[PDB]
Amino acid sequence: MHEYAVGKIKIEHPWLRAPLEGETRAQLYMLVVNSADRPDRLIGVKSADFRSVQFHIAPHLVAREDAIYLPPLSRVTMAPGGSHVELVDISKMNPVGWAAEMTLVFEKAGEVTIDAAVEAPDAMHAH
Ligand SMILES: [Cu+2]
Numbered sequence: 348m349h350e351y352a353v354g355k356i357k358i359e360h361p362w363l364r365a366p367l368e369g370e371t372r373a374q375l376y377m378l379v380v381n382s383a384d385r386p387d388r389l390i391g392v393k394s395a396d397f398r399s400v401q402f403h404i405a406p407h408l409v410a411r412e413d414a415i416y417l418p419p420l421s422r423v424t425m426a427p428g429g430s431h432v433e434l435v436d437i438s439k440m441n442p443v444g445w446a447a448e449m450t451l452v453f454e455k456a457g458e459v460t461i462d463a464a465v466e467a468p469d470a471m472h473a474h
């Protein structure tokens with residue numbers, strides 16, 4: 348239910364599937380609304396909790412480019428079965444039910460700090 352905004356970009360309920368026990372990878376999901384008349388891209392995700400990210404097409408295939416394409420005047424859902432950001436080399440993760448602080452970097456809009464809800468490894472979310 349929580350949302351964020353930067354430039355003409357709006358991010359709705361970012362959330363992630365917590366890694367399995369002993370694993371260092373997670374999946375970041377969100378709904379992104381681009382109100383600009385120009386395309387934009389999610390080109391980066393940064394945090395102290397992990398050291399890098401990858402952009403995946405379902406299941407876990409490295410995508411077209413290392414970014415999430417955001418067409419003008421469009422709503423893009425990153426969700427299980429579609430596309431997501433893979434959080435790699437997680438060092439520190441809050442338990443399920445809490446939030447993980449990270450910074451999203453948009454190509455045009457710039458940076459925004461968010462708190463993604465940490466959810467169970469098999470969780471779903473309808474926006
Ligand atoms: Cu929310």
Ligand SMILES: [Zn+2]
Pocket residue numbers: 374403406407408431432433
């Ligand atoms: Zn993946």
